[PDB]
Design a protein around this nucleic acid. Structure first.
Lengths: 147, 77
RNA sequence: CUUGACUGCGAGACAGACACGUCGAGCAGGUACGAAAGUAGGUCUUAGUGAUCCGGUGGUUCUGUAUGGAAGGGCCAUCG
RNA sequence: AGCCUGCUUGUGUAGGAUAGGUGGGAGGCUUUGAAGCGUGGACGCCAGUUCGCGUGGAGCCAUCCUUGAAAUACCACCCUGGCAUGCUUGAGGUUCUAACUCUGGUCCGUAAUCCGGAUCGAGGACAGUGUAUGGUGGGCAGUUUGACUGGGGCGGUCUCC
RNA sequence: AUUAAAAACACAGCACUCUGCAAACACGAAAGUGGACGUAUAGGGUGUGACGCCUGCCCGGUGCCGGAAGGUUAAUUGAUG
RNA sequence: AAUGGGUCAGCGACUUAUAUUCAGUGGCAAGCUUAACCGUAUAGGGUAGGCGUAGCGAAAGCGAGUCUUAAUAGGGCGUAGUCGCUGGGUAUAGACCCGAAACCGGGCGAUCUAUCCAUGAGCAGGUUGAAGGUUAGGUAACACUGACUGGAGGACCGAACCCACUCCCGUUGAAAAGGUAGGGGAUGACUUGUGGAUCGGAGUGAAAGGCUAAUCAAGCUCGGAGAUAGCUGGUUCUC
RNA sequence: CCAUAGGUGCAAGAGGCGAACCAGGGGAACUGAAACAUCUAAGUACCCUGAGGAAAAGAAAUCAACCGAGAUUCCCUUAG
């Protein structure tokens, strides 16, 4: 149906046409700008911007190479409680952790997350599931120390 | 009332025939749900309650051919 | 020994509100007995049963919605 | 669960083995079948079989050599145990957010917190709602429940000889 | 209200059961409102009726609750003839 | 000694329309007649259509005959009308007239009564005397005793006030539910003034099927509606 | 951040009433069937919304049989 414009999904390509579900194209790809419905009207204009499509495919991965050197530094020192007792008493965080991974990481912050593994147990380095992709995610490492 | 803002479907009536033909009345209600539609020109969601047959016509013309003649019969979206 | 517990009929009557009912010479088809006249259209007689509409099954050119066929009717035989 | 492909698998009387087979092939010359002892593999209606040949570039099952209901060695078609991976598809399980949801929080319209809109928070392909179908349903409604009869109720009787 | 003032109905007290909050439940075609600006020491429903001594056996019938192994069982698919 | 009627005077019950059958009297006659509509319009035109002159058969079909049948045999059926007019019938419409209980559809009503809501005020007088507190004893202390106070109550007698247990009178009442004597409650689950809320298979109800404008096992009013009545009553001048 | 919602200022129109008629939305029951559930009564009574002096409907993806007829609306027959 639609014409793909992105290459970093799990079925995307450069200019290949795919057949997907109607709810996956209506809701997700099109209102962001990652695809366009196949037409026979402006097809003289899509062929003119094929040079502009491949220069856009040589820039999205270029900014990512100047970005991964600031995410895995693990220099974030979160000031939670429970210094030297043993029992869980620290401020874990579900809204204040998005501001902590944005002041020294990636600036995007929106947490509509389905999770029964949110708060963490007794004092130690554990993991918090944070907004990382749009149809998957894995958990990010969090350092919990004294205050 | 239960009408659509694209196709103009209203509730109709009819019967409820049994296995000995005991006629009794019911209503036929159109399927219709709330949904938000992105435009590019006004770059904002518009929310309008449409049928499931209104979702298919929006998949045909795209958003603005159906938005314009809705204005060209004088309605609020 | 056998299949007359036959097929097409039926002048006449008896009964009887009607619908149903009972007896039947004789004629034509093809038969079983008997040497042959002849006798056989169930059982000595009188009880043993239920209309119409439905639908089901065998025969049927008689119809068959432009035409050629079919479906569906119709008539005959028979089942709940 | 269909599909593909190449398909390499095919063990009873008995042949040296082994029969899903139908046509070419009489033998088969790519280290000839290198043999031959034994090398591993997986293997087995089991010692039955395929592939490495340890050596080393070394004759073999025999082409009826047999026998066996059909003979090998070779090229062809397909199928099977399944081998894999694909192609599609059902059914189940987990997770994710972007649909929908919020009788959550704080801004704005606004001097209102009804209703919108913006943003975070939760749930999340569930809930809910159309339409088709099962079940339950005196909650509710339209109705039915005969006659003769020494009063009618009880009992007896409704057709034929 | 206008032939029946009671032994009838109520009752404080007792037990059973359903309801984890956008609650069970009721009125509403629906929006919503009561419940309740309350939160299981609460809120609905059913019976018995202060107090005292007590409340026996029967789970076959009917209802509710619990369990899935197996049987039958709806549209929906449509092989085959 | 079954029904009905006080007498008089007025009104008060077999009709109409469209189809069709039989008789009476008429027109043309193997033929008779037009409906709409035209029209100087009760004339004239208009013969579309209908009934007849030929039947038998379920049908094709064949015809003074045809069907059944193997039938050529038997047997069944078959070999002067039409359009008016006036009468007797019949069909469909309220169909000779009067008469139900009920059912359904839009409304009006909680100024009475049934519960609830907001804001108000009403209850002469006279008794009883809880908890508590004070102080005196008391006790390791708390218990516990006395005295003084104190003023609780769906408490007690009793009038306004609300209610209705008995007798008699009344029954065409003074009154479509009273009266005169006696009764029960009378500081509360009270009585009541003004203003509002809830309604017809629907409300309210300490529950009797009670009340919702002298009407209630589902009001009142206007429409469907001249409801339906194998049932009662009545039906008019002579020979 | 842009700029939509929103808010004012002006212009033009509508609102209500009326007996029947017309087209749509919603739509009973008594009664017939000598009972009564399909069916009738009947898409009738009533209730809403429109418009007009009338409305609606109309210029063939229509009917006929191998012949042909050419928009709709209304009366008379086919025909109970």
């Amino acid at each position: 149906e639609v014409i793909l414009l992105e290459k970093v999904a799990n079925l995307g390509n450069l200019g290949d046409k795919v057949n997907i579900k109607g709810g996956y194209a209506r809701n997700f790809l099109l209102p962001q700008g990652k695809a366009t419905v196949a037409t026979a009207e402006n097809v003289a204009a899509f062929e003119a911007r094929r040079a502009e499509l491949e220069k856009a495919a040589a820039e999205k991965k270029a900014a990512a190479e100047a970005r991964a050197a600031q995410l895995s530094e693990l220099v974030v020192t979160l000031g939670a409680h429970a210094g030297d007792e043993g029992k869980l008493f620290g401020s874990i965080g579900t809204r204040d952790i998005a501001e902590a991974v944005s002041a020294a990481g990636y600036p995007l912050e929106k947490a509509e997350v389905r999770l029964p593994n949110g708060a963490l147990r007794n004092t130690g380095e554990f993991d918090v599931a944070v907004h990382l992709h749009t149809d998957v995610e894995t958990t990010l490492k969090l350092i919990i120390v004294a205050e | 009332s239960r009408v659509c803002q694209v196709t103009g479907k209203g509730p109709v009536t009819g019967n409820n025939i049994s296995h000995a033909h005991n006629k009794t009345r019911r209503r036929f209600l159109p399927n219709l749900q709330h949904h938000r539609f992105w435009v590019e020109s006004e770059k904002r969601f518009v929310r309008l309650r449409v049928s499931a047959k209104g979702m298919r016509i929006i998949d045909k013309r795209g958003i603005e051919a159906v938005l314009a003649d809705l204005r060209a019969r004088g309605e609020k979206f």
